[PDB]
Design a protein around this ligand. Sequence first.
Ligand SMILES: CN(C)c1cccc(-c2cc(Nc3cnccc3S(C)(=O)=O)cc3nccnc23)c1
Ligand SMILES: O=P(O)(O)OC[C@H]1O[C@](O)(CO)[C@@H](O)[C@@H]1O
Length: 433
Amino acid sequence: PLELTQSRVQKIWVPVHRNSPTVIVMVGLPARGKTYISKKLTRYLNWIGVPTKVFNVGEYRREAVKQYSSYNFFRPDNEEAMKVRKQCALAALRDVKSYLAKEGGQIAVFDATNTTRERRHMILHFAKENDFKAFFIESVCDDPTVVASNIMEVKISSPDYKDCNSAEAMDDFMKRISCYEASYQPLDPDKCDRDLSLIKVIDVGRRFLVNRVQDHIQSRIVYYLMNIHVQPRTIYLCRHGENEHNLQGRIGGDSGLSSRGKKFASALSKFVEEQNLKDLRVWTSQLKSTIQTAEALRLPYEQWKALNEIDAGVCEELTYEEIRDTYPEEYALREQDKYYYRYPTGESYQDLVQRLEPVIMELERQENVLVICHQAVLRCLLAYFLDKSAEEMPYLKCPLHTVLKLTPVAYGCRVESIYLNVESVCTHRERSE
Ligand SMILES: CN(C)c1cccc(-c2cc(Nc3cnccc3S(C)(=O)=O)cc3nccnc23)c1
Ligand SMILES: O=P(O)(O)OC[C@H]1O[C@](O)(CO)[C@@H](O)[C@@H]1O
């Protein structure tokens, strides 16, 4: 029954006067997108604030053993290589234990083939004895075009194949896959795996079998998988054209575009038209400056309250100088912990991420999209796509009148900056000390 004090940074009332971690087990033949999924899921989970880390058994093998030479290493009759592979799995599990039990981790993604019941049974046993949950994700695909595309995009360029050309790396990889085919026992949720928590994904997200979801992190993972796709597309992110508050160095508010902001809007329209995209969706916030920017495009657009700039609470409409003079401790606390700091009666970047989550989910479902938003919001989105930490997120550089063009490549995202040659003030503030 305790008396309360409001914490300085997060503004949380706390009393004063003195969920088991999960191992996600990937399952499947090589080149079925296990690593692609492990990495993308981990980016999502970390961004929403669930500390996650991938333990790729392949990387342990590459460190334990000299340069790769061929698929013979993966022969099931290779007694020695089988021992090494098993010890690499056990070493990766030691690190999973340490991460989840001792380093604050919440989710460990065990990224390997794990194609045998025996291997999976051993992982289960490891989980139950450390009191970890286990959740299996299996990717099944028998389409040779898909497999070949995966091999060309991320396998032949890997360090294993440094001394091979393309044709021979591809030949080797195909034989390598064949090494796993005889002993591959797929997840069997009807019968033998009836009691496991799992998702089996068939044909690149065409069909799912989902068995026994045990907690909210798991249903959300499932929802995420049911919304992502691997079709090629482009995401453009930018801010509103310069506005009248920007000219005054004032934060928040709902001002309109300055004369230069309107020139940017016309320049954006020209840029978009020259990209020559199919079915470009345009999203804005509900604040005037983004909507006036979209109005220059002559494309249909949709407004989202969730894309509204961070709410600076009682500091809305003020300059950073007025904040420093009127609220000196608040100004200092934010410079010290810019991600977690909440403005009084307002928001933190942490809050932003919670309200942007539905934006991210819908972005995953779409194809070509242009998002016209605001500085702190744009940083949050960009952090997601580029896998930037919470500590880095509030300092990412997203200038006015510059389009950030994002294109999926390999296991991530390429970003290209395109400045549309219209002057503006600069609203970027570096980390100080
Ligand atoms: C959509 N969803 C829900 C989902 C779920 C699980 C796997 C995959 C998947 C993803 C994938 N991606 C991937 C893997 N390596 C290189 C490039 C890419 S790509 C297409 O992202 O540029 C390749 C796959 N292959 C076979 C089966 N499944 C694959 C997808
Ligand atoms: O987190 P920072 O660096 O203060 O940036 C957010 C600010 O940027 C702006 O979008 C432009 O100054 C403000 O409206 C908002 O308060």
